[PDB]
């Protein structure tokens, strides 16, 4: 799953709504 | 949108040169400031997190068959929690890493496509946030060295 793969590559791309 | 294409091509050209793809390839002041700030931010990002985007084309199956909407789908995961300047920098750095890797793996055809994909993604997905958050002149104020 591309989406899963992507999520791995960008694990550190998290944060808030704001 | 033309300025978005130019920013993408400036950044990717910079990253390819910096890695020494001057030889895999046959060889305003307001916008200059934007380009320089983005180059420096992308360098900073890469110095901070350079394990982050290794072996991309393999993990993401980016090939000469890949269509824009697969790139879009991947990048959407980067902005899953919303857009900010740090993730926009990450986006540019990702694209740069994809370009370098593509050249390294003898898939040079991808460089012009990645640049088109980034410009589209910027215009359609990121520009609406940018134009609510001060535009690139505000990015310069935040991340420009000077």
Residue numbers in the entry:
A (entry chain B): 570 to 587
B (entry chain A): 2 to 28, 80 to 198
Task: Copy text verbatim from the article accompanying this structure deposition.
In addition to its role in mitochondrial metabolite transport, VDAC1 has also been implicated as a key player in programmed cell death. Here, using cryo-EM and NMR we show that VDAC1 oligomerization or confinement in small lipid nanodiscs triggers the exposure of its N-terminal α-helix (VDAC1-N) which becomes available for partner protein binding.
However, the binding site of VDAC1-N is shifted toward the periphery of the BclxL binding groove yet overlapping with the BH3 site.
